[PDB]
Design a protein around this nucleic acid. Sequence first.
RNA 1: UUGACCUCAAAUCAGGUAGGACUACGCGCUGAACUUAAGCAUAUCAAUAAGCGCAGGAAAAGAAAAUAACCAUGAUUCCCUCAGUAACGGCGAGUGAAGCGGGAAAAGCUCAAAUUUGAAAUCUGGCAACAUUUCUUUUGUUGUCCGAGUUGUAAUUUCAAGAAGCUGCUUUGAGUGUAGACGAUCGGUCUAAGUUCCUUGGAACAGGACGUCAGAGAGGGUGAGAACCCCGUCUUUGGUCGAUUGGAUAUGCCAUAUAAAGCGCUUUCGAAGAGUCGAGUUGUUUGGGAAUGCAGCUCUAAAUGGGUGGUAAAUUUCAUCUAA
RNA 2: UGAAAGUGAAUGCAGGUGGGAACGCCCUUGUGGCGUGCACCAUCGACCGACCCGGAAUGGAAGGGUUUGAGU
RNA 3: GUGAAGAGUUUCU
Lengths: 207, 95, 147
Amino acid sequence: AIHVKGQLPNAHFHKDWQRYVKTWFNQPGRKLRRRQARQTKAAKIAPRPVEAIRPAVKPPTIRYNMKVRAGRGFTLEELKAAGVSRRVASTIGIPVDHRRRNRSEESLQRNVERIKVYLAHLIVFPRKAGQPKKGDATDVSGAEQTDVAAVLPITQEAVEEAKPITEEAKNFNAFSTLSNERAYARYAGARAAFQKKRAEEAEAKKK
Amino acid sequence: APGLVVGLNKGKTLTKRQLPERPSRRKGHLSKRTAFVRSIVREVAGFAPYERRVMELIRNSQDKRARKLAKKRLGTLKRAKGKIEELTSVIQSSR
Amino acid sequence: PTHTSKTRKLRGHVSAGHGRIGKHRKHPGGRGKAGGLQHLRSHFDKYHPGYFGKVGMRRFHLMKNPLWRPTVNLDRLWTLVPNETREKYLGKNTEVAPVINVLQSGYGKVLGKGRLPDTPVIIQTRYVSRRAEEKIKQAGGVVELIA
RNA sequence: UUGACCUCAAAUCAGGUAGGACUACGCGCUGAACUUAAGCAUAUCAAUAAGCGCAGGAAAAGAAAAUAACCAUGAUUCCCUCAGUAACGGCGAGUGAAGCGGGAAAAGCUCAAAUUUGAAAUCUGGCAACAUUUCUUUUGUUGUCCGAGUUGUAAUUUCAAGAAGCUGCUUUGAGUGUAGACGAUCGGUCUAAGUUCCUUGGAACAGGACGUCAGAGAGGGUGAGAACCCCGUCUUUGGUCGAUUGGAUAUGCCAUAUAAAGCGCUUUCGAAGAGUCGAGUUGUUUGGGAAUGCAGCUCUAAAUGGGUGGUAAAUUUCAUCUAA
RNA sequence: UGAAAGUGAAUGCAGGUGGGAACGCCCUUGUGGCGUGCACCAUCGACCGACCCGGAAUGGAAGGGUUUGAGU
RNA sequence: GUGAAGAGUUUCU
Ligand SMILES: [Mg+2]
Ligand SMILES: [Mg+2]
Ligand SMILES: [Mg+2]
Ligand SMILES: [Mg+2]
Ligand SMILES: [Mg+2]
Ligand SMILES: [Mg+2]
Ligand SMILES: [Mg+2]
Ligand SMILES: [Mg+2]
Ligand SMILES: [Mg+2]
Ligand SMILES: [Mg+2]
Ligand SMILES: [Mg+2]
Ligand SMILES: [Mg+2]
């Protein structure tokens, strides 16, 4: 029974847990298998990059919206503005995300720049060898499998190292502004319901 | 849009832009062909028995009773108010 | 390892340390922590007061990301900046003042514990305590709020 | 009277097909109690054992009627984290997920709703010919006739759109054998070296002396501990076969290639799944709390409608998705 | 810290008092006196949160409190 | 489900 010092025990071992114990003795084996699959895939799709180029997007929620990460695929607007048809995008390793949209010019411009850099570094082989066509390249001899992250890395946003302190900043009251702004949002509804009572119940005064 | 994390128009200020039309959001619109088909079907099929009962209460100016019956028949009040307005238009369409 | 265990020492001692009178029976006061209100009360009330009962409101579907707000005090503010930035501004007279973006160091609110050196600095933060803002302003610096 | 059509039969009719087994893993149904709660009924054991149906090399899931509430994200699955947390619980014993974040892997699509209506443009079967083959064992092509099909088979479209019209733009799939190599492999071997002497012993594979090879001193065999006795071990090419336009000038050549896609302004448009959604109620289930999922029964929709937004309700906004 | 919305840690040498390790200095041979005072404990305050006050639409600044917290 | 009388725009015997 309980008589020792420490936390009251919590162990969730009342089912037949030994029946479903998962061990990891295959962890180095799985690691070797996965590396061999990557090597097999790389040799098969060569000289195409092993990884497709991805957009840069901002993660949701206030915990991560200060960061930048790879997204699933480029938006239809982003492909349009970079001069790439959506049916052609997949044929040259550009993923298409029909779900994501560009709510701001910054997201659009950032990813349009990624596509433009990709296209400028891209060597499209002609469909028929030795008969170059529009949109292709005529110097395919120096083609090799290269990492997209070596050419188009995901870059985090930089900072202002230093700047002058203006008189406007010196007069700014940060704490009071935070308290006022929170109070203003908090009592917006009461203010709106008050405004109805301020201008509607007074209408009987006319007649 | 102060650029703070509190207040009415909180959040970082970026360059806003117009999102393109998503055709999936067109759902719920009434196409002219579908409206024509439904008018024909309403001619062939009549009214459901509860619809006749609701219209009768509407024609006798028992507005609360019609609302109680339509909500009781359809479930929610929101569907009832839409149905009573539709049946009210029918009643006035005949007048 | 087993060679150094007390079990090895009890070989030849009949009761294995569990007594001849009371023994080492199966669960003689029940299993787990059962009985905190009845026969284990003198333990629960002495070492885990507050265990039984309810306190406070429920909150359905809590999501902790909108609540995220780790804090940093004033005495750590200058430690967030690189060594080269400290040497350039800390203690000097410059036309520009360094910017310390506390959010990119992983903090959502600047709190007021400790003291600041007497150099101007611009503190970019989502939130700041009142006393933290007063001490930043006394050092000649400012707080600029961000999202 | 016959014939047509419809519906319904029969045949050892012509050709097919299902069952049984394997159950580690997989998808469901049904479903305990021991046990824990120091008794015990809710609870727990457990959405477990037993029982029943059904698969594959994986299965299931899957291109949002999804998140969120952000500067937003972006099918599914799995791992780490979230987290023994929010929550459930004779709030007792006990139980207990999810969004974000990091990582593995990544891939996207098909229908139904449209008048081809200056042409059912679609499909199966029989018969015949002609090809083809892991293969006389396989797999098709054409012709013809008969059936199917307008109670709708094709074609453009699937909301991410798109279609019809106004106006401007470039142009592509298949056989032969080389080198580079590559799957089954091989007449399978160029692949190295002590079986000398002395002692003990039934036997030398032991000890000693003298040598050797080593990209080989892994292992096994042989009359006792053998790198050099035997098989092997290590190292490294040349004979085939087949996938052989997979890559190269893939040359040398087949002759695919004459009419189908890309963006581009303007319009008017833009069909979008019903006893289903939703509501009540009963049972069950869940961490899901005035119902999380499932199921019965009652009621039963709509067209900017409808779903979701984790506290019941009425109203008003906003966001996001687009079910059956 | 608070159930929560929230708010969030220096009057001062990061305080005072008592004991105190180690060190230094004076005696004069004692279990000495003097000065700093680590750790730790007891203790008087200060500071942050909750709570209870008066208290000159929204905010709670200065002033307080026998209290309260797994704080500084 | 389909029809007839009766009861102070209806559903009860
Ligand atoms: Mg005994
Ligand atoms: Mg006894
Ligand atoms: Mg019991
Ligand atoms: Mg017992
Ligand atoms: Mg019993
Ligand atoms: Mg079973
Ligand atoms: Mg099989
Ligand atoms: Mg499958
Ligand atoms: Mg879709
Ligand atoms: Mg359970
Ligand atoms: Mg649909
Ligand atoms: Mg059941």
